[PDB]
Design a protein around this ligand. Structure first.
Ligand SMILES: [Zn+2]
Ligand SMILES: [Zn+2]
Ligand SMILES: [Zn+2]
Ligand SMILES: [Zn+2]
Ligand SMILES: [Zn+2]
Ligand SMILES: [Zn+2]
Lengths: 340, 337, 340
């Protein structure tokens, strides 16, 4: 049902968690993970993962990870006049930063409204205070996290959603839905399902979770820019992405075979995609003894802004594809992925 | 003989991520001279040569199998391809060059290039997207330079592609053979990494997997002799004291320099502008002192690299003496803190 | 058969003849012309032509010429370090010059492998010698010709070819095939059939051959840039060219009438073509009392490089068109071309 999918998306995209401060998103995931998994574990930096044990003898470790954080800003100084100067957390196009609603998140638990009024460090951020003292008197300090404020809404044709943070609440929902869907099932792999911390700042959580859990194979779950509207590639509604290239990662032949095989058998709509940015796979695949990877993905328009536009159908295709992928991963198939 | 051996390796096609054909070559050449042939998660191949010596330290010796090339980013409606670069290309050398496009179904299709790399037309002589696709061609396909190894007029030098780093690949092959009979004071790991051209990627994984105490990269670097820079074709193997990614530690330097004099090795000092597998490897585990047993060559990362055979011989003798002299005493000295 | 054509094309394009140095191609044309021709003559600069005598009473002389030279380089100096600086022979886009194989052709007959390592005079040409002395010991001198080194190969679909010097071994082969196919037949014109010297350095041979043989009508046979791939006109496989204009030559109305009439009666596939460069016709038509001309043409992608891409099919359309033209050129038709 589309009405339900939207509600689920509205919930996850309206949660507020900037890199290094993803407790609200973790709390959400813990509550959705626990009932469908044997064990809930955590890495040093705050990443949560459900372990789903396998009855299979040589069950290979498979890690599936999205990321919990979203792009945002962080207070670097409080001016004497009460305004804030910020540092970007995650990559922002300065063209989109001016005149935007945000929520400043205080250490003592305040949620104070803040707007931006072209270098980021010079952009005025404004909470309507009369001076430094008053701002400070509301619990505000240098280091406080500033999250975009944007509700999720259906587009006129009801096929698409406009919201913030589809990157990467898509992957948060995708991970949640996966746990629900595989609950009854018994897999041929030892499944580690969850979400990374601190991806937006340089794939930081993917270093630590991949190391901690020693997976043989890794599937990132993450969305990327759709350039269809800009004459570039990645077209909304054309399905899940086969990410063969990005500056940090090359899709290996063995993995490519398995992706295309699985997509063909489960009747999945997919499109080839040449990434220009990096996903968690970029860091993960270099960890331990080496971990073949990809990113099970959706594209979306205007990533890293308040107004990301994306297709609901793309999610369904991506979900089914992630389901089929993990179901089919076992001793035989990872050995084949890693046939050297 | 040395030429044919170089002709063979240099003409093999293996772009980063797609090095099975070079793995197949190393497998066949490593297996008979080694106790065990192992593989990392990403596809690096290494022979293990067991040592009798008690407390024998682990030594990793690695070149890399991948060369520079391009990858299909899209097929245009008109049947041409736009590409992304796999490994660093100077855009001045890319136009009007032959390539082999490698299909997943096993086709080898002739492709030429016709300024930003993404704007350069890659052409296979197809009428439209459909025809290109009917030949098995898909976004993601590997595109490898098409250039053969030949002798220069004086028969002392070779012109080819991929001497970076089929040098190191051959270097690792000749090492296994030379050490076949021998027994060493070190637990030898001997082979070649994957995906070096795209950021020393495999060097992370192989070094983490095999937990060596000492690491010897085997790679070639630019020669500037002809442009007035440093690095002179024919002046022997490289003493790489510096690059942006890695500093040659005093312990290792003493061991490099000492060995070189003992074995009568011709060598030149060499400050590097680019990285080697050592840059990544030395930072793995608890830390692993490293260098690169190197040769310089003119016009690296092109279809037309030019290099001296003599330099190979020099670096080979140097590699041999180095791993022979590596034992508990000498790696403890190297790590004398 | 398409396989026999490739052989003939591989042959012509692999010969080595930069401007001023076309003995190798001239040796080829002598061997192919003599059996099918009454007489073989030469101009003061090195151009060769077969003379096919006519029985027709007031038979007009008709000159058909390709050119034997290709673009390459010439040693300007030998540096003390053994490398060479060069001067261009023919126009090169400097973008295609770096990292290319060549054969340096010595006066004493050595063929020495040379590669290039942005102004052309600044580009390092490398023979892999130790010093100026060693280079000179191999007979290398300032002036030695440096010829592109590139073999001829079929494209995947076997309809097209990748090689060097299709400009203008196209026309060399076109002139050869003309001789063979017309051997035995008898024409209403005194046919002069052959190839010019030094076209690439300024249509220099076309000056001297035309003056010497005094034709009434001139047919250049030369290939030109396909622009299709860049959104320009001239499309591979679309046929033989109707060169109505170029900076050095205007197609005269009488000649145009003859061209279109002939093509259309002989079922020739053709495409209109506005040239941006010159061909032998530009020099030839201004010689003696005036000599109406065109260029019986074909386009090819990436001219003046090691990697030119062209259709065998186009050659066949050009060849059929050339035959039809020369067979139909006689006193009535050249008089009509010259109807003033
Ligand atoms: Zn992301
Ligand atoms: Zn992002
Ligand atoms: Zn290298
Ligand atoms: Zn390299
Ligand atoms: Zn021409
Ligand atoms: Zn020309």
């Amino acid at each position: 049902s589309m009405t339900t999918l939207f509600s689920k998306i509205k919930e996850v995209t309206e949660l507020a968690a900037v890199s290094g401060h993803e407790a609200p998103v973790r709390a959400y995931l813990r509550e959705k993970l626990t009932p469908h998994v044997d064990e809930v574990v955590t890495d040093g930096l705050g990443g949560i993962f459900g372990i789903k044990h396998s009855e299979a003898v040589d069950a290979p470790r498979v890690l599936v990870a999205s990321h919990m954080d979203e792009v945002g800003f962080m207070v670097s100084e409080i001016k004497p006049d009460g305004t804030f100067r910020v540092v970007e957390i995650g990559g922002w196009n300065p063209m989109v930063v001016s005149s935007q609603r945000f929520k400043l998140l205080t250490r003592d638990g305040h949620e104070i409204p803040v707007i931006s009024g072209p270098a980021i460090a010079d952009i005025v951020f404004d909470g309507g205070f009369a001076d430094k003292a008053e701002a400070e008197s509301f619990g505000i300090r240098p280091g406080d996290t500033i999250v975009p404020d944007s509700s999720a809404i259906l587009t006129a044709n009801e096929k698409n959603i406009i919201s913030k943070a589809w990157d990467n609440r898509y992957g948060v929902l995708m991970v949640s839905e996966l746990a629900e869907a595989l609950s009854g099932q018994k897999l041929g792999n030892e499944l580690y399902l969850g979400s990374n911390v601190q991806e937006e700042v340089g794939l930081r959580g993917a270093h630590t979770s991949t190391t901690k859990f020693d997976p043989e194979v890794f599937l990132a779950v993450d969305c990327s820019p759709a350039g269809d509207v800009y004459g570039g590639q990645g077209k909304i509604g054309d399905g899940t992405l086969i990410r063969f290239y990005d500056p940090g990662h090359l899709l290996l032949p063995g993995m490519k075979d398995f992706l295309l095989t699985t997509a063909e058998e489960a009747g999945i709509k997919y499109q080839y995609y040449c990434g220009k940015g990096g996903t968690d796979a970029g860091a993960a695949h270099l960890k331990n003894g080496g971990v073949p990877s990809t990113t099970i993905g959706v594209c979306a328009r205007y990533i890293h802004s308040h107004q990301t536009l994306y297709a609901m159908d793309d999610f369904l295709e991506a979900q089914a594809f992630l389901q089929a992928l993990v179901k089919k991963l076992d001793r035989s198939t990872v050995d084949l992925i890693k046939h050297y």
